[PDB]
Amino acid sequence: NRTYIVTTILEDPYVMLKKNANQFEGNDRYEGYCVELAAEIAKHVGYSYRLEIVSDGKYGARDPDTKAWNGMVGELVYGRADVAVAPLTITLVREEVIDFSKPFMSLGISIMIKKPQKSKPGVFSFLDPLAYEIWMCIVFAYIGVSVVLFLVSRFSPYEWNEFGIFNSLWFSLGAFMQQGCDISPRSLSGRIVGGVWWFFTLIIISSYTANLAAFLTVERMVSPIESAEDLAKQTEIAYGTLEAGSTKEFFRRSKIAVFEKMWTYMKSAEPSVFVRTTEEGMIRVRKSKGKYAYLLESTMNEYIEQRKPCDTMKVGGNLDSKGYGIATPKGSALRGPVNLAVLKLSEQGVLDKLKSKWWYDKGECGSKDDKTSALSLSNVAGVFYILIGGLGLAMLVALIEFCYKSR
Amino acid sequence: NRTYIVTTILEDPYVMLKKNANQFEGNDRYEGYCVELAAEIAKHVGYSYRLEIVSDGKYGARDPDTKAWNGMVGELVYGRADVAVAPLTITLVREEVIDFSKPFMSLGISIMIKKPQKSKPGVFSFLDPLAYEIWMCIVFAYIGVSVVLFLVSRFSPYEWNEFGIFNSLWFSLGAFMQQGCDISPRSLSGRIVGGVWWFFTLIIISSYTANLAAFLTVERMVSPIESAEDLAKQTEIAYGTLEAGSTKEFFRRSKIAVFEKMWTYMKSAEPSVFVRTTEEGMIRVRKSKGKYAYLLESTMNEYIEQRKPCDTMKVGGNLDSKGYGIATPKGSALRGPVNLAVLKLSEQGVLDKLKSKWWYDKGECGSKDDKTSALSLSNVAGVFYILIGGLGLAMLVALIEFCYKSR
Amino acid sequence: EKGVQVLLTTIGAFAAFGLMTIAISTDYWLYTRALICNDPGGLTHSGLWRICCLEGLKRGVCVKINHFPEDTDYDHDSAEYLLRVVRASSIFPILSAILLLLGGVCVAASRVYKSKRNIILGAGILFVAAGLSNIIGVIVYISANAGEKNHYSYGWSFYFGGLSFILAEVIGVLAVNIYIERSREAH
Amino acid sequence: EKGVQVLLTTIGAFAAFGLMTIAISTDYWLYTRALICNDPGGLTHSGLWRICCLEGLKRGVCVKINHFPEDTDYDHDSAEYLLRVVRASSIFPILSAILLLLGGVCVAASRVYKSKRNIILGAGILFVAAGLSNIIGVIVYISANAGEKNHYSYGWSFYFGGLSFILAEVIGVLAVNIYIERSREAH
Amino acid sequence: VVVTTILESPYVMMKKNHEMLEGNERYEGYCVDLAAEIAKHCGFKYKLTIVGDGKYGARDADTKIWNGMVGELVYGKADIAIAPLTITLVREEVIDFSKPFMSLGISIMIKKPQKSKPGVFSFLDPLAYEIWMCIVFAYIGVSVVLFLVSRFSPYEFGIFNSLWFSLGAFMRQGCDISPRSLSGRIVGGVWWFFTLIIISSYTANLAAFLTVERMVSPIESAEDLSKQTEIAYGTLDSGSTKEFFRRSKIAVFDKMWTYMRSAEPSVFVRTTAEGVARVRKSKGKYAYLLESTMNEYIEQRKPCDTMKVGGNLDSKGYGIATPKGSSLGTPVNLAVLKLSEQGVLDKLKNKWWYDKGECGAKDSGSKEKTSALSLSNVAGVFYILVGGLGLAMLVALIEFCYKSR
Amino acid sequence: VVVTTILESPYVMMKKNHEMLEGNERYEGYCVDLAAEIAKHCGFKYKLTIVGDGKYGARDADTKIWNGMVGELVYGKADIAIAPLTITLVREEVIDFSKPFMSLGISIMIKKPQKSKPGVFSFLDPLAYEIWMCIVFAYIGVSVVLFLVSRFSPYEFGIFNSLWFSLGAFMRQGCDISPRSLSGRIVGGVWWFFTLIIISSYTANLAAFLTVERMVSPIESAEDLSKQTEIAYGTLDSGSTKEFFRRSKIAVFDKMWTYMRSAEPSVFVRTTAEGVARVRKSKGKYAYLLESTMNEYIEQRKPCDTMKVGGNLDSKGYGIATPKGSSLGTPVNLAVLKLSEQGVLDKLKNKWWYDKGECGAKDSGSKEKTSALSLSNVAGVFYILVGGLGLAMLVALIEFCYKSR
Ligand SMILES: O=c1[nH]c2cc(C(F)(F)F)c(N3CCOCC3)cc2n(CP(=O)(O)O)c1=O
Ligand SMILES: CCCCCCCCCCCCCCCC(=O)O
């Protein structure tokens, strides 16, 4: 027959001050997952609740010497608050001094990486297999071959042939494309020139095809980590963690081989992969362009993935399994009713609906959602543009040839 | 001031009966690594030795209930023999009851696989990228295209052209090889035929080149195990072990992850990878054609690799480290001198010389000893043979054409 | 000679027709292990219509092939249903045989009505079309045998069909050349 | 016109020679980071003979290139020693300039001794050979710059050499055509 | 103390050699080891007691009575339960659960993708269809431009011969005529370069396709799965999954329920083995909805041709139960958290799911000896060829008849 | 008891923070953990003690005194020595060693192979030189056969034009004339098939080369290193390795000693760091000879540009020492044997060498993003082209001058 004081913490989306904070006061000033969850819990239990924030602004913990509980756990143990509706992890030490409910969320450690963006292949990417030096030297060698052919085919007075400079250019160009023309050299000198040019073109074009094949084959065998083991084995990618937190606890006290190896690499690194705050890790992932992987709670990873900017993705399954729960003091009367309400809401789908609402519906990205490896028009666009430009230039040159011949 | 009884066991090359067993008696009837080592030890210590064999024909071991030592260890403990010059492994239990010397050989568990033979690529292996069905259907489609071209180019009376059946065959053949001929169709029907044939040839030849590239690229990325971890990760290769022996002891009592996994796979398999005897394992490796890997003592693996047949190879380093030693009873006077002699021989290189002699110099294979991936004349021999045969057939047909026209 | 050319054309037409009928109705196209007769299976010489296993107590027992051992959209599932329908019907080998028969009929009728020369042209067209139908038929047959390292081999009905194709093309060439000679003579 | 053709040939020869000499003696062929001037290195415009860094207190300081920062068989180690020797000597660009000069001399001397027409042919041959030497020179230069992701770029001496090649080939064509006209006239 | 339990692999399975020397080791599994470990901390003696019925607890409407291991606990026959019993409200109102020792949910099982039989016209795969259409458009345009240039500004090249020249250029066959004018030669040169690049690209990407195989799952979630209808949806005839879909108000699962009710024949199965079999034989046209633990277990079972996709559509937990008021409840509740923090539960999960995996790692073998191309790979081009030959014959006869009159 | 040791990583090395709470934790290493384990087994207290004279135990000829850890043990300063002390005859005549806790030997260190700079005429690599010569022979033969056939059985094809036709066929360029007779057409068709196969093979194997890197070590043993002379040897100027080569009777090591003595400049180095640096500098022209454990340690340390090759040339062991008549030798021997049987020494070896490894595993990375081909890859064909152009010019001038006479 009284109002119950519900402690809480400020952590998006669980609880966060509303935009019109000044207009509203008390419970109506806050919005989030846990305020609505507390509303539903109160309705199922039929108790009136006044919401409050933890002064320490932090989750429970015991000072080593003082042996004093801080945060929400301290508020509960010392009688300050009756209930704690918040992302309070279930742990052995806490469960001893407070009564947890059954989990309303299941989570774990998860991997956060720079999002693989839709790369633009690049106009004139069809030249990538060969360096621009090769292409330009090809052009200049073409000019030289044409000139030498014209010379060795026309200088001798006894012939004055069909191998003028223009037709020499045409023959050389057709030779490079492996498309013969109406004329072939008949002299030994012209035939030597043609032979060396032919050999050159054969080697060059086979090299182009082969290196393009290599490019595409290598792009076709690239596999993202998709897991911790893939992350662990490779050393190219640096994977960090918050310096202080249960994640470091998990990695230090981990008997499993891969997590022990991850700790070995994290402690033995320079610059320190670890970061002071989670915002630091997120910005570092975004800036480092795939060189950084951040290990953190799955829920925050999902929320961030749904926030603007949309340049971050969660990979793999959760490494470990934990759970958040509603906590009350030992000997309280609300423990059983609260646990039953949590289970009721879980079965009814209320919690899933709230998760979707506050993680996805409110999501700036707002997008839950074609690997083929077939070449697209973007891969070969430059050659189409060259074709169109050449056709236009040909029309223009025909127009010039027509204006010329006016007499 | 007496002869010392030296116990021993029969195990190649350590000790083995000489070919002329009947002619010789005493110490002279045996030959091997350990008889000469015993000779050298006696010379360095200056004691006369009578060589004998262990009746049990087995190495030391303790019966669980009886608590009786068997084999050479029993001989030493009970006073039957004074010294034990043999491949007697140094172990904790044995070292308690007998005095081992410093090792004269270092060994360990090692891998034994079917030797990678110098495969003959195969004459007419240049057709492998395409099935014989494709080749033969190509031939028949060539005939059909030639006939249809001749028809659609010559049936109309208004033309009676240059597209006879022989020239149609020639045009089609040149089209397939992407080598034009002196004639091209001028009608719509002939040009339709030529176009479809051209498309066919383009696709087919690109497919041949591409699949050959795939073949060679895949043959170029194949890596043999070269280690236990490579052996462990893959499951294609079945790797066994002797059912009874220190190898099974090592794999069962192994805290290391990879050896525990190896035991898990060995126990959980059907048919049982394990074998009763080592000859069984060797023959199984030889027959199974790379499907079997046998784990055994390094020394036996090296000896087998040097015996005829030469179809077996050792890969990787030794998994664990052990040592053979010369053993004497507790409180014996020969312990110190024997240990000093063993070390003297090791520094002088006597033991290495004996190892080389009895493992390699006597080796039937007798061969201690070029990866390029470049194509060899064996890879493209069939096309050269076709060339030579075609030239011969051409000379023969010219001869026929000459005999014809006699009038 | 014109007469011997026509004789060769007719003989080749009849030989090709006989070879193709024999190939269709002999059941020795393929040799393989099936498991329809007693893991790897039992040796059996399949055919175009029925499969006959030659190992075990079911020796000389020829059981019909079904061509539909799975579930697919009968109306229009995909190209595989059409392929299996064409393979089951075997309309292309039968069409080749029919066209060869008609070509032979036309060639024989050319002896009478000797004034008309387009008969030989029709015969050549029929022979060439028969060859094309044969090619489609063999491509369908080979494609439809693909399950998805079992050794297999081909028998003498297969190679009889191949001979039929070759002779059909040969006699088509001969008929076209005959028509050309006739037309030139009338000029 | 013959006169203007000869004038263009001579002007082009002199322009190509000037461009090539300037390219050889300017030190703006390559822009890159070297670390010879203050990990990645300091911006510097290298050349054909000396390298000049433009960052730090060593501004405007041009230090000679060595072309031998390792140990190799001086007599005959491998093709790399020959490549580095050719790159250091730069005999091919110099040869192109020399041949262009000789071709211009021959063209000018053709005005006198106008009876002799093989002078223009020799000039054209010299121009074409000069172009070929230029091509070899640039290939050597580019190959010898390969260390074994450092951004680099080319300057105006490089492109001056390219212009020299183009003009040399052009004037070779003109000289050959002039010789052809002369020979035809005498016929 | 006696620990109730149920027979369900890998939680309980008869020991390999239980027939001889059964002792207490006649039963082995994940939950047996878990019971041992927790009773270690609790400090009690435990003897396994599989309830005679194989049913997980449930309550009868008319009788209002509890049957199963829950009945064993509530009625005093048993002192503790260790079997995988999901935490739900109705069972919690009568007994006290512990904190979950594994968390799970509903998941999708699909047949592992395999190399499908190549289709006719798979020779076009290395290039996208838009490239092919643009190639055709470029052929038409280049032929037309060459024709116009040759007619307006001549120096032979009609539209027919222009098309022939362009086609021969694209197929690397040359031609009997080549342009003589600068404009026509520009057209020819750019066309030649285009053909070179395009054909090299085709060959290169075909090599890529043929040297590394890359199989992609048709479905990677439940949304994508629900949108399409080519694949059918399976749920056991009676279970918590089916009831979850029945009661669900989330849009996607409402759609899934609508589909499953309407779809014919019955997508439901009477047993899990039936669902896995339907998945394994339906050649990738069946997707079974089940629990994540069973799916993961099966993924390492022979013939090893099925896999789990996506995440989990619900959240559930397995919790070791005790009868209400027992002294064991608190110690076991603390024990589960102790094991979770230490890593014992993870160790057992790996032990009974991944270790003893009849399968291997994510890739036991890769880059297998590539197979020779088969006629089925290039049959479409044969069909195209023969059709073109027939069309040529028909066109020739048509011209013959028209020119006769 | 005080355990003598010595400073040589990774066996003894100063702790990350040794000034703070130095205690017994100022030192860390493999030997430290080993001493802990064997003191636990022997039930004794141990306090570490570095040796005053760094030199490993040795005995001066004139003085006849032992200087080092051996001196510490024999003269009562210390009871036991847990350090990488090699077992030797002279060193055992005064102290009692244990059974080896690691076995090692002389081994070869080489610079890690890396992509070498492409050489001119590397465009010929995909095909063996024998194929190229047979191609030339086939060109000559086919041209000659075509000439003979055309001359003897004409239906244009002289030797010159026959060679031109064959060359144009091999380059996929076509010719201005084609054979008209059956024999010439047989020759042409077979040559065409040959060219098709050969050029497809060249392109395919080049794609293979450029897709996957496959580096091969120049040497894989001492014998291979013994026969050739291109690579230079190397040992510490004073040590057991140099003596082993000096006193050896095995032929291979006798040859090695001959080379090492004769070769100028001196191959010997003063320190092992000097040897590793010289290996890292010579870009694959230096091979160092050292103890296997140090070689592996270095191979697993950055910059990670060295490897061990081949098997160990000798056999040696490291053993815990103890003075004659003491009481610790007998228990420590059984201790090391027990640790070896259990797997402890293997665990520590893996944990100090492989784990704690700055470098990666054997397959650290693969499938490197392929690079565009560079002019240096195809420069030889440019040189060939320019040389052919010059030769053509020279030939033309020669003809012109000849006709001028
Ligand atoms: O007992 C001995 N133990 C030794 C141990 C090591 C190491 F194992 F690294 F600790 C080393 N070297 C130090 C670095 O360069 C290579 C090896 C030398 C040792 N020596 C001198 P050696 O007589 O020349 O062998 C001894 O005498
Ligand atoms: C990249 C080089 C291409 C440049 C093409 C430009 C066209 C030049 C054509 C010049 C022809 C003039 C001479 C006609 C024939 C002759 O007199 O010998």
Short mmCIF file of C-alpha atoms in Angstrom, two decimals, chain B residues 221-361:
data_model
loop_
_atom_site.label_atom_id
_atom_site.label_comp_id
_atom_site.label_asym_id
_atom_site.label_seq_id
_atom_site.Cartn_x
_atom_site.Cartn_y
_atom_site.Cartn_z
CA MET B 221 48.15 -24.93 -54.23
CA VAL B 222 48.25 -28.52 -52.96
CA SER B 223 50.22 -28.79 -49.72
CA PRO B 224 51.19 -32.08 -48.04
CA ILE B 225 50.62 -32.32 -44.32
CA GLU B 226 54.30 -31.84 -43.37
CA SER B 227 53.23 -31.95 -39.70
CA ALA B 228 50.84 -33.42 -37.17
CA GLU B 229 48.59 -30.36 -36.97
CA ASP B 230 48.04 -30.52 -40.72
CA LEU B 231 47.35 -34.22 -40.26
CA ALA B 232 44.95 -33.55 -37.38
CA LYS B 233 42.84 -30.81 -38.94
CA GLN B 234 42.01 -32.82 -42.06
CA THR B 235 39.95 -36.01 -41.89
CA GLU B 236 40.53 -37.35 -45.42
CA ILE B 237 43.70 -39.16 -44.32
CA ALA B 238 43.35 -41.95 -41.77
CA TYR B 239 46.25 -42.17 -39.32
CA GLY B 240 46.72 -45.22 -37.13
CA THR B 241 48.98 -46.58 -34.42
CA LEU B 242 49.98 -49.87 -32.84
CA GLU B 243 47.24 -51.10 -30.53
CA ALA B 244 49.71 -51.93 -27.74
CA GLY B 245 52.72 -49.74 -27.10
CA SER B 246 54.10 -46.51 -25.70
CA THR B 247 52.58 -44.62 -28.63
CA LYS B 248 49.05 -45.35 -27.41
CA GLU B 249 50.22 -44.46 -23.91
CA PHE B 250 51.46 -41.11 -25.20
CA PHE B 251 48.26 -40.32 -27.07
CA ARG B 252 45.90 -41.31 -24.25
CA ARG B 253 47.84 -39.50 -21.50
CA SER B 254 48.34 -36.42 -23.70
CA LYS B 255 47.06 -33.11 -22.35
CA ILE B 256 48.00 -31.31 -25.57
CA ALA B 257 45.00 -30.49 -27.73
CA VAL B 258 46.17 -31.96 -31.03
CA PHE B 259 47.27 -35.31 -29.60
CA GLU B 260 44.04 -35.60 -27.62
CA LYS B 261 42.13 -34.94 -30.84
CA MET B 262 44.25 -37.57 -32.58
CA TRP B 263 43.28 -40.10 -29.92
CA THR B 264 39.63 -39.08 -30.22
CA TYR B 265 39.71 -39.75 -33.95
CA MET B 266 41.68 -42.99 -33.60
CA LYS B 267 39.39 -44.57 -31.00
CA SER B 268 36.31 -43.29 -32.86
CA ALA B 269 36.85 -44.89 -36.25
CA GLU B 270 35.74 -47.85 -38.33
CA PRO B 271 37.50 -49.86 -39.62
CA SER B 272 39.97 -49.62 -36.74
CA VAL B 273 42.87 -47.54 -38.01
CA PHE B 274 45.12 -49.37 -35.58
CA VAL B 275 47.16 -52.46 -36.48
CA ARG B 276 48.44 -55.45 -34.55
CA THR B 277 52.04 -55.28 -35.79
CA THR B 278 54.34 -52.75 -37.43
CA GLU B 279 54.69 -54.82 -40.60
CA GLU B 280 50.90 -54.58 -40.81
CA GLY B 281 51.05 -50.80 -40.60
CA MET B 282 53.79 -50.58 -43.22
CA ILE B 283 51.93 -52.79 -45.70
CA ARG B 284 48.70 -50.89 -45.01
CA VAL B 285 50.42 -47.58 -45.75
CA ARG B 286 51.90 -49.00 -48.94
CA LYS B 287 48.60 -50.46 -50.18
CA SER B 288 46.20 -47.69 -49.13
CA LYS B 289 47.82 -45.23 -51.58
CA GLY B 290 48.11 -42.17 -49.36
CA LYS B 291 44.95 -42.85 -47.36
CA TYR B 292 46.97 -44.10 -44.36
CA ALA B 293 49.54 -42.45 -42.11
CA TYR B 294 51.38 -44.58 -39.55
CA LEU B 295 52.73 -43.07 -36.33
CA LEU B 296 55.80 -44.83 -34.95
CA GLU B 297 59.35 -44.50 -33.68
CA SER B 298 61.49 -42.25 -35.85
CA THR B 299 64.33 -44.78 -36.12
CA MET B 300 62.15 -47.54 -37.57
CA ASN B 301 60.58 -45.03 -39.94
CA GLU B 302 64.03 -44.04 -41.21
CA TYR B 303 65.13 -47.66 -41.57
CA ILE B 304 61.98 -48.60 -43.48
CA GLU B 305 62.35 -45.54 -45.70
CA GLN B 306 65.77 -46.95 -46.63
CA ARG B 307 64.61 -50.55 -47.20
CA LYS B 308 63.28 -51.98 -50.45
CA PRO B 309 60.57 -51.14 -51.46
CA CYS B 310 61.36 -47.42 -51.34
CA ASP B 311 57.68 -46.39 -51.25
CA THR B 312 57.42 -44.66 -47.90
CA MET B 313 58.54 -41.34 -46.47
CA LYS B 314 58.86 -39.67 -43.09
CA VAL B 315 57.38 -36.19 -42.72
CA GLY B 316 57.66 -33.58 -40.01
CA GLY B 317 59.65 -33.45 -36.84
CA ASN B 318 59.45 -35.85 -33.95
CA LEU B 319 56.34 -35.25 -31.87
CA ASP B 320 57.93 -36.17 -28.53
CA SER B 321 61.49 -36.69 -27.33
CA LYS B 322 62.86 -39.93 -25.90
CA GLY B 323 66.20 -41.70 -25.69
CA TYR B 324 67.77 -45.14 -25.77
CA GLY B 325 70.45 -46.00 -23.26
CA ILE B 326 72.75 -48.72 -22.01
CA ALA B 327 71.46 -50.11 -18.72
CA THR B 328 73.19 -51.80 -15.80
CA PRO B 329 71.97 -53.06 -12.41
CA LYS B 330 71.84 -50.76 -9.42
CA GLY B 331 75.15 -50.73 -7.59
CA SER B 332 77.10 -52.00 -10.60
CA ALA B 333 80.67 -50.91 -11.27
CA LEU B 334 80.16 -50.40 -15.02
CA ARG B 335 77.68 -47.51 -14.79
CA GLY B 336 80.17 -44.65 -14.75
CA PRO B 337 82.64 -46.09 -17.24
CA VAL B 338 79.80 -47.00 -19.58
CA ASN B 339 78.31 -43.50 -19.46
CA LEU B 340 81.71 -41.93 -20.11
CA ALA B 341 82.28 -44.32 -23.01
CA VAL B 342 78.90 -43.45 -24.50
CA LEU B 343 79.72 -39.75 -24.38
CA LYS B 344 83.24 -40.32 -25.74
CA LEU B 345 81.72 -42.15 -28.70
CA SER B 346 79.10 -39.45 -29.23
CA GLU B 347 81.65 -36.63 -29.35
CA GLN B 348 83.99 -38.64 -31.58
CA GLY B 349 81.13 -39.20 -34.03
CA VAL B 350 81.23 -42.98 -33.64
CA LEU B 351 77.49 -43.24 -33.05
CA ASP B 352 76.65 -41.01 -36.01
CA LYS B 353 78.96 -43.06 -38.22
CA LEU B 354 77.32 -46.31 -37.09
CA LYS B 355 73.86 -44.85 -37.64
CA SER B 356 74.78 -43.77 -41.16
CA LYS B 357 76.37 -47.14 -41.87
CA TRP B 358 73.52 -49.35 -40.68
CA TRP B 359 70.69 -47.07 -41.88
CA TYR B 360 72.00 -45.58 -45.14
CA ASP B 361 75.21 -47.28 -46.31
#
